[PDB]
């Protein structure tokens, strides 16, 4: 039980991930933030108003900001990395360090351990020591964050490198010692205290699927301690921090999300976490810190919001004064200030609109085209700094209305983010989205996502019936890799070095692996499904024109499918009688008469009825998958059986599984 | 911890108590002092059965607290022992519990303690002329 | 000159306000018990006003019922950490003000809350507005501005209470 | 029993069809003292279940 | 706020069937429909009432002001029942045969008895404390909602009818006053202001009306189930309480629709109703869910975001002083094509292209949009959108033409409003009547409502179309009253044949009902007879009784299918008769309308079919 | 009869008093009122209505 | 001459703290006991003793 009041502070421009920090300063600390235009600023919030300090000049988009100190001195040097170089400010507007670190594209993460500087890139990772290159690594996948264990509480510097493919490569020097496996692509990670864990060293990670962990990286192996795998708390962890807000004596875990959710985890079990307070914010949190910034003497949480609203959650009540008829006076002060500002701004912008109309805007959309694993549906999430007016969805929690015509979605009132599901079949590769904000010229920005023709994992099971398939002849390995990127959801674009790469995929609708190995001129695409290899054959032949069977595999796939169809049919059969039995329920109180069989349905009627709403889509998808399986497994032998479909449809209306397999093997 | 009764460790003391009545009269879960928290810090009790009641006292430090185990007379509480005059029950040593667990304390709560472990019980017949237990 | 009385809830120990409500010359670092019968001059939100002090044990909350009738000005306080011992402080105004002596004079009559830096609280007014007791209207005041021990908010209902004298 | 037509299931005592004590006046059911002038419309109480009405 | 009381009722409440009434005279209670056709009553214990029939309306009010008890009304698609729950006794059990789709209870204009108005297929009705027909009129389509509001400020309340035709009409005791054309099937009306009423649709649109204009309107998901105006903030003016399909109860304002209070539930909201449970002398607000939970109540930074948006606009204009010549003008043109749609062509007098168009119209397109999509190989300057409205009501498309170059990732959105006229179709049996003057003004009417002695001959075999033309031309030439001379042979004879089929359907239904009643009595005897064999353990006769029951059930199910098809056909015939009355009256403006309706009904109760047709032919 | 079949005594009594307003001294109506009052088992009014029947008939076997 | 907070149980187990001058609460929690004890070490009015069907050992301090 805990309550935090939402007190708002200065608003800055749109911010990236982990772009807010608190200067350690017993009184109120200072907040420092970085806008996407380069204007790094800092304030102190003396009394209600932000007393700005060294609001610098605009430049490149501030991709990361971190405060550190050379020796055990109180860390105060704030380093940013805007376009390709790391700039550094003291606790005032004096720039002292400007390391050019000439690179190709940009920086996406950086860590300052005194003089040691561990920076990331798209794929590259560098470790400098005072503008001197000392370590250089090139992962095969994009890096999300880099950290180094405390070089003081331990002796060796072991930088950890979080890759996009669900691994943490805990490398030393310029080569990986070992790799820890984690569920979901890691996005944030920070040692879980002001030191890095009492019992030596501990690394706390948070992934983009929504998952926390405490990988304890020893010299040669990790020691998993706990995990906060969630069910309802979906949303990419963009920030996490450690601070004792509850006041019990042990530091708590302040964790942010991508759907606004801010959570505090207490360790009252003395070893394991437990949720204590959660709060939604209507935007995407990008940075979280503890301490106090307003009215020293009360611990609070500072939360950087995507659009820039640097909000705080305080432990101090807001109703300080309560006399007579009343409705506080700070509300009246803020009201009057906003009144005056909006009057004068209306004057100016009306005159400028007149001048512009008589003489007659780029923005950012933090989109996230992820793939839900518990379902088979991508969950697209658009975000804009301002509010949206309408979103087109052209193809080849939400409060919006449908845009159906090609879906047009209008967003009611003043909403920034929009989450919409998209369910695509195992085939049908080929999706645009026009976003329009509520600004005056009312422009529109288009995004082009791809629905690929399988969530990638790290291991398969070779004891399954593998329906191998071999491509040979006249390839540049980069080109074959480009084909596989065209064909597979989660693969890095840059061709991995070594001219020989192997990936271990997995179908999410039902567990069937798709091991894919390939060299400079040869490729083996093993599988557990006939549909997967048929689709691969067709799409790869199409790409080329642009530029074996285990006789038991069908049995295995049908045995996989059977439980799902059985469950759907039982769903239908029970929901057919739910309401008829409910009509009998309302009389004679059900004391002695109802059969136990239907009595098992009278309780779970609610869940049955709410699953029946989604049933027909699953049934249609299963019928389509079965008919594609049948057609393809007859197509490999060289036949064309596009005509026997209606008999299969009738059989599935009956669904005699043994008669089904008989019709499969016979005709 | 599964009570049938409660108590008060200190009639005027900064502490507390409890009583345990689990299975077959075992009263060895008696929670204890540091009464700011009254935690899992529980005093060692070697009581024979459940103290179906409890009490307190004044001239002693609530020692007079009574363990009225079923089938046995209450007992003034003195940490690990009793204080009984001429009808209040005897010491901590379970007079009924001990026979079951005096000779045949072979194994855990399973038929491989007595019915399938008749090695340490066909040699020991110590609780003589088994009536109480 | 203008006195001030406060009582408080039972089983709390919430009486430590009058020391930090006193001046800076003689501030006390020990916890100040609400013994009552206090005699001092303290510069308040209107002028250098006076005070009075009492103890609230249920057995003991009757000496405050022995000094209840009098007082130049008045005083409001409560225990806003009490989730069970604040049902009993509801009747305390009907003990205090319902009495005939309190009702007769239009001086200062307000009840305020406390224990804000403690990890539970309620409405600012608390005594006359949170626990359904908004009906203190004919009493010629209102009370506000409460913290726990850090020393805030004694000038909060002051226009209704302190500067109203 | 098998035909329900009354709107109210448990109406106020005194507004539905569904003196001397049984120590003086003979009775036919739990209550319902014996009447004069049997008419073929007399129901004089009603059974609860088909089994009770049969047995 | 905080729910002043809460409780959980184990019965599913039907959504629009909830009422609060002091059925004990001074003790308010809750009446609410339930599954199986039973109406439950919550006193402060739940008491069931066996309607034994699927309820469709439910209210509660004062029907005879001589006593101070609320009368529980229960409507069914073929019945209507007033009920004095205290002394259980039917005030009146009337059989409507038109249905009960929406009912109210109040005092109409110039009627000294609180009427129990009702709405069925196409005809309203009215009943006093005994059940005498005192009010009856015909409307366009299925009535879905009724409320009593004093439009016009004269102290006697007119009744507001929400037709399935998407229209809201206001009816006096006999005369029609006005009609506003909304955009979907109305579902709920609620008055608490002088001439202001809050309305809901099935789009999800909740809005507010003055006399003949909308104060505000908000369209969302989870279309509103029950709206009711209350004074939550107690500022002296009522606000629209609303219960949506998800659970949200948002007390808004009757000013520009700004949410003031908000609450949520676990299931949908059946009904929001006012009534003083706790006996405090002041009204309350009870929210009742579909799943049966009741809860009762007693009566900040976004502007800085707008400032930031203004500053962003200023940033854009300062940057100025996917690019397009600034003098790009979108010019539209409407036309109509036969070889069958109203085409709307949009162009740009430049080399720029129209990447996408997102037309937004309320009732024309299915959904609210019709995004026109051109493939990358098909892009050009001018793009045409085909439109096919379902009915002749003037609509206002809000086009949003996405203007930009060929290979662009960001391009402009030009907004443009274009109104399709009432008779947008009809590219370039008779009713006759006279007009005032100014054939030029007739040219004006024809040119402003069509995409092209003073007697007007309209030769449309369709009757709804001629009605629309006559009413529009009357409202255009500022005409109050008018009488016509109409002939619709092929339609009148069809209505005659329907009228002939009516009584045959009635007789067949009566025969089947008697037969099924006989078989049901047989089945009850068999059930009792069957039970006796089981008790005495005579299994052979028990099996015999159950075989007999099986055979009777099969016969009864066959008869049930027959009777159900016959009843559906009979309901269709009744709605056809009433639509005929309404289309005959609709062809005449002002008082000459009302007469026909009355006469038409007085021509059906007497079966004078020839004179009936003469009433709808000349008037 | 119809109203008694639907278990509505107080409707049948109002209808009977309406009938007696039409026929001022009918014996069958008074006897039906008395039968309903005896089914509801409040004899203090059934005796009054049987006495009215007697004042009308005085040979009525029922009353 | 005196009585502080004199609580009680309930059959439906609602905490019913009773002030000398007024009632305190009525809850919906799990079950109750035969005996408890206000064993406050640090001056709490409340007992902080818990009994449950499940065996919970409570310590909550709300002619």
Curated annotation (Swiss-Prot), chain C:
GO terms for molecular function: BBSome binding; GTP binding; GTPase activity; phospholipid binding. Keywords: Cell membrane, Cell projection, Cilium biogenesis/degradation, Cytoplasm, Cytoskeleton, GTP-binding, Lipoprotein, Membrane, Myristate, Nucleotide-binding, Protein transport, Transport. GTP binds at residues 8-15, 53-57, 114-117. One of its GO terms (cellular component) is cytosol. The keyword GTP-binding applies. It is found in: Cell projection, Cilium membrane; Cytoplasm, Cytoskeleton, Cilium axoneme; Cytoplasm, Cytoskeleton, Cilium basal body. It is a peripheral membrane protein. GO terms for biological process: brain development; cilium assembly; fat cell differentiation; intracellular protein transport; protein localization to cilium; protein localization to non-motile cilium; protein polymerization; protein targeting to membrane. It comes from the Eukaryota. Belongs to the small GTPase superfamily. Arf family. Interacts with SEC61B, ARL6IP1, ARL6IP2, ARL6IP3, ARL6IP4 ARL6IP5 and ARL6IP6. Interacts (GTP-bound form) with the BBSome a complex that contains BBS1, BBS2, BBS4, BBS5, BBS7, BBS8/TTC8, BBS9 and BBIP10. Interacts (GTP-free form) with IFT27. Involved in membrane protein trafficking at the base of the ciliary organelle. Mediates recruitment onto plasma membrane of the BBSome complex which would constitute a coat complex required for sorting of specific membrane proteins to the primary cilia. Together with the BBSome complex and LTZL1, controls SMO ciliary trafficking and contributes to the sonic hedgehog (SHH) pathway regulation. May regulate cilia assembly and disassembly and subsequent ciliary signaling events such as the Wnt signaling cascade. Isoform 2 may be required for proper retinal function and organization. This is ADP-ribosylation factor-like protein 6. It comes from Bos taurus (Bovine). The gene is ARL6.
């Amino acid at each position: 039980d805990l309550n935090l009041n939402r007190a708002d502070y200065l608003q800055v421009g749109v911010t990236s991930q982990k772009t807010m920090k608190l200067l350690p300063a017993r009184a109120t600390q200072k907040v420092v933030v970085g806008d996407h235009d380069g204007i790094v600023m800092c304030f102190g919030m003396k009394k209600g108003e932000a007393v700005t300090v060294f609001k610098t000049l605009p430049g490149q988009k501030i991709a990361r900001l971190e405060l550190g100190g050379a020796l055990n001195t109180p860390q105060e040097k704030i380093f940013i990395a805007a376009g390709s170089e790391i700039r550094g400010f003291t606790k005032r507007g004096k720039q002292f360090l400007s390391f050019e670190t000439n690179l190709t594209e940009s920086i996406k993460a950086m860590h300052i351990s005194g003089s040691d500087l561990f920076l990331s890139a798209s794929y590259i990772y560098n470790h400098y020591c005072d503008c001197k290159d000392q370590h250089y690594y090139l992962s095969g996948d994009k890096i999300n964050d880099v950290i180094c264990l405390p070089v003081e509480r331990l002796l060796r510097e072991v930088p950890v490198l979080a890759c996009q493919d669900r691994v943490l490569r805990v490398l030393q020097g310029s080569d990986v010692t070992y790799e820890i496996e984690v569920p979901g692509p890691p996005t944030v990670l920070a040692l879980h205290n002001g030191n890095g864990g009492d019992s030596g060293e501990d690394l706390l990670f948070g992934t983009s699927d929504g998952k926390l962990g405490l990988i304890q990286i020893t010299t040669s192996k990790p020691i998993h301690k706990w995990e906060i795998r969630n069910e309802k708390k979906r949303g990419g962890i963009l920030c996490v921090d450690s601070f004792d807000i509850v006041g019990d004596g042990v530091k708590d875990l302040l964790v942010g999300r991508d759907d606004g959710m801010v959570e505090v985890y207490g360790f009252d079990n003395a070893n394991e976490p437990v949720l204590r307070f959660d709060h939604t914010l209507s935007e995407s949190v990008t940075s979280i810190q503890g301490g106090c910034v307003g009215k020293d003497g009360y611990d609070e949480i500072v939360v950087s919001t995507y659009s820039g609203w640097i909000t705080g959650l305080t432990t101090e009540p807001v109703h300080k004064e309560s006399g007579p008829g009343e409705e506080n006076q700070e509300m009246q002060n803020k009201i009057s200030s906003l009144r005056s500002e909006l009057e004068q701004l209306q004057y100016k912008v009306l005159q400028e609109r007149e001048k512009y109309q008589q003489s007659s805007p780029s923005f950012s959309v933090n989109d996230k085209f992820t793939l839900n694993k518990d379902d088979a549906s991508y969950s697209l999430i658009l975000e804009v700094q301002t509010a949206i007016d309408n979103v087109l969805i052209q193809s080849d929690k939400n409060s919006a209305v449908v845009s159906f015509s090609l879906a047009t979605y209008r967003c009611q009132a003043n909403t920034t983010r929009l989450e919409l599901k998209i369910r695509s079949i195992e085939g049908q590769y080929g999706l645009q989205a026009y976003v329009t904000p509520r600004i005056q010229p009312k422009t529109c920005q288009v995004r082009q996502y791809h629905i690929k023709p399988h969530q990638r994992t790290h291991f398969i099971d070779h004891d399954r019936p593998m329906n191998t398939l071999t491509l040979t002849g006249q390839f540049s390995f980069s080109e074959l890799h480009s084909w596989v990127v065209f064909c597979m959801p989660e693969v890095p674009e840059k061709p991995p070095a070594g001219e020989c790469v192997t990936f271990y995929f997995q179908n999410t609708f039902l567990d069937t692996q798709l091991e894919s190995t390939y060299r400079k001129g040869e490729g083996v695409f093993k599988s557990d499904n006939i549909s997967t290899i048929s689709i691969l054959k067709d799409v790869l032949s199409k790409e080329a024109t642009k530029r074996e069977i285990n006789e038991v595999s069908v049995k295995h796939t049908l045995k996989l499918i059977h439980p799902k169809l059985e469950y759907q049919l039982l769903l239908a059969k029970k929901v057919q009688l739910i309401d008829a039995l409910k009509e009998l329920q309302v009389h004679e109180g059900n004391t002695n008469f109802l059969i136990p069989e239907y009595r098992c349905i009278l309780e779970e009627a609610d869940h049955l009825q709410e699953e029946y709403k989604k049933q027909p889509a699953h049934l249609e998808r299963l019928y389509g998958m079965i008919t594609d399986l049948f057609i393809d497994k007859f197509k490999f032998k060289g036949t064309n059986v596009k005509t026997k479909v209606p008999l299969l449809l009738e059989i599935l209306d009956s669904y005699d599984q043994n008669a089904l397999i008989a019709f499969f093997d016979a005709a | 911890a599964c009570l049938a009764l409660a108590d008060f460790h200190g009639d005027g003391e900064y502490k507390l108590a409890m009583g345990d009545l689990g299975p077959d009269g075992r009263q060895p879960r008696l929670k204890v002092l540091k009464g700011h928290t009254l935690v899992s810090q529980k005093p060692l009790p070697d009581l024979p059965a459940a103290a179906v009641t409890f009490l307190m006292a004044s001239h002693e430090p609530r020692t007079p607290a009574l363990a009225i185990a079923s089938g046995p007379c209450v007992y003034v509480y003195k940490n690990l022992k009793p204080y009984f005059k001429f009808s209040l029950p005897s010491l901590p040593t379970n007079p009924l519990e001990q026979d079951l667990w005096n000779q045949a304390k072979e194994d855990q709560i399973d038929p491989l303690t007595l019915k399938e472990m008749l090695e340490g019980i066909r040699e020991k017949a110590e609780v003589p002329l088994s009536v109480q237990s | 000159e203008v006195h001030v009385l406060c009582l408080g809830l039972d089983n709390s120990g919430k009486t430590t306000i009058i020391n930090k409500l006193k001046p800076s010359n003689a501030q006390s670092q020990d916890i100040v018990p609400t013994i009552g019968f206090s005699i001092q001059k303290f510069k308040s939100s209107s002028l250098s006003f006076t005070v009075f002090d009492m103890s609230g044990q249920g057995r003991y909350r009757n000496l405050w019922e022995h000094y209840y009738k009098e007082g130049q000005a008045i005083i409001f306080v409560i225990d806003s950490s009490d989730k069970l011992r604040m049902v009993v402080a509801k009747e305390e105004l009907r003990t205090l003000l319902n009495h005939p002596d309190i009702k007769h004079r239009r001086i200062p009559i307000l009840f305020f809350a406390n224990k804000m830096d403690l990890r539970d609280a309620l409405t600012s007014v608390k005594v006359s507005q949170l626990l359904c007791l908004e009906d203190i209207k004919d009493k010629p005041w209102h009370i506000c501005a409460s913290d726990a021990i850090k020393g805030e908010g004694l000038q909060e209902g002051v226009d209704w209470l302190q500067d109203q004298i | 029993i098998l035909d329900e037509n009354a709107i109210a299931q448990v109406p106020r005592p005194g507004t539905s069809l569904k003196g001397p004590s049984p120590a003086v006046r003979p009775v036919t059911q739990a209550g319902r003292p014996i009447t004069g002038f049997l008419r073929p419309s007399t129901q004089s109480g009603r059974p609860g279940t088909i089994e009770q009405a049969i047995k | 706020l905080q729910p002043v009381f809460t409780l959980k009722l184990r019965h599913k409440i039907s959504p629009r069937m909830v009422a609060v009434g002091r059925y004990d005279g001074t003790h308010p209670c809750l009446a609410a429909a339930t599954q199986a056709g039973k109406v439950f009553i919550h006193n402060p214990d739940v008491s069931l009432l066996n309607i034994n029939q699927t309820v469709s309306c439910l209210t509660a009010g004062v029907l005879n002001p001589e006593l101070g008890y609320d009368a529980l009304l229960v409507g069914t698609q073929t019945n209507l029942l007033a009920y004095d729950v205290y002394n259980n006794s039917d005030l009146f059990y009337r059989e409507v045969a038109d249905g009960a789709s929406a009912i109210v209870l109040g005092t109409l204009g110039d009627i000294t008895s609180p009427l129990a108005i009702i709405g069925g297929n196409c005809a309203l009705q009215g009943f006093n404390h005994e059940g005498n027909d005192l009010f009856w009129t015909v409307t366009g389509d299925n009535v879905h909602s009724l409320a009593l509001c004093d439009f016009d400020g004269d102290g006697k309340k007119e009744l507001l009818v929400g037709s399935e035709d998407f229209d809201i009409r206001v009816f006096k005791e006999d005369e029609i006053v006005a009609e506003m054309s909304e955009t979907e099937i109305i579902t709920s009306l609620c008055p608490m202001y002088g001439s202001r009423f809050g309305y809901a649709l099935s789009n999800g649109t909740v809005g507010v009306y003055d006399k003949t204009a909308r104060y505000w309107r908000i369209k969302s998901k989870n279309q509103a189930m029950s709206i009711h105006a209350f004074d939550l903030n107690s500022d002296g003016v009522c606000e629209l309480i609303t219960g949506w399909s998800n659970g949200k109860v948002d007390a808004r304002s009757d000013r520009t629709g700004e949410v003031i209070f908000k609450d949520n539930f676990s299931s949908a909201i059946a009904g929001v109703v006012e009534g003083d449970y706790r006996m405090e002398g002041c009204q309350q607000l009870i929210c009742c869910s579909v799943d049966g939970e009741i809860r009762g109540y007693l009566p900040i930074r976004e502007l800085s975001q707008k400032k930031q948006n203004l500053l962003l606009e200023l940033r854009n204009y300062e940057e100025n002083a996917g690019v397009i010549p600034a003098n790009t003008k979108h010019h539209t043109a409407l036309s109509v094509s036969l070889g069958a749609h109203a085409e709307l062509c949009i162009s740009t007098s430049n080399d720029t292209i129209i990447r996408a168009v997102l037309i937004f119209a309320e009732g024309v397109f299915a959904g609210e949009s019709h995004v026109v999509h051109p493939s990358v190989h098909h892009l050009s300057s001018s793009v045409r959108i085909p439109i096919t409205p379902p009915k002749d009501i003037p609509v206002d498309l809000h086009l949003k033409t996405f203007v930009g170059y060929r290979s662009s990732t960001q391009f402009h959105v030009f907004e443009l409003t274009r109104q399709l006229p009432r008779f947008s179709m009809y590219a370039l049996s008779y009713v006759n009547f006279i007009i005032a003057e100014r054939a030029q003004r007739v040219v004006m009417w024809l040119n402003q409502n069509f995409l092209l002695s003073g007697e007007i001959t309209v030769n449309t075999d369709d009757i709804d179309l001629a009605g629309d033309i006559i009413q529009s031309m009357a409202s255009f030439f500022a005409i109050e009253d008018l009488q016509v001379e109409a002939d619709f042979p092929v339609y009148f004879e069809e209505l005659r044949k329907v009228l002939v089929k009516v009584d045959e359907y009635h007789s067949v239904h009566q025969k089947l009902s008697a037969d099924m009643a006989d078989n049901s009595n047989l089945i009850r005897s068999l059930l009792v007879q069957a039970e006796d064999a089981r008790l005495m353990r005579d299994m052979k006769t028990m099996k015999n009784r159950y075989k007999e029951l099986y055979d009777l059930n099969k016969d009864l199910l066959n008869g049930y299918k027959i009777r159900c098809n016959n009843h559906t056909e009979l309901l269709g015939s009744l709605k056809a008769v009433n639509q005929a009355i309404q289309r005959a009256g609709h062809l005449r403006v002002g008082k000459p309308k009302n007469q026909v309706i009355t006469a038409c009904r007085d021509a059906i109760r007497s079966n004078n079919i020839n004179m009936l047709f003469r009433i709808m032919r000349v008037g | 009869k119809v109203y008694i079949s639907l278990d509505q005594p107080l409707t049948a009594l109002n209808l009977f008093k309406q009938g007696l307003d039409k026929f001022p001294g009918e014996v069958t109506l008074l006897c039906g009122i008395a039968r309903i009052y005896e089914e509801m088992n409040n004899i203090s009014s059934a005796t009054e209505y049987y006495k009215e029947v007697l004042k009308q008939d005085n040979t009525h076997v029922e009353a | 001459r005196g009585l502080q907070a004199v609580m009680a149980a309930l059959a439906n187990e609602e905490v019913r703290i009773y002030h000398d001058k007024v009632l305190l609460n009525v809850i919906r929690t799990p079950e109750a006991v035969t005996s408890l004890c206000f064993g406050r070490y640090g001056r709490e009015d409340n007992t902080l003793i818990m009994t449950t069907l499940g065996g919970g050992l409570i310590i909550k301090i709300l002619k």
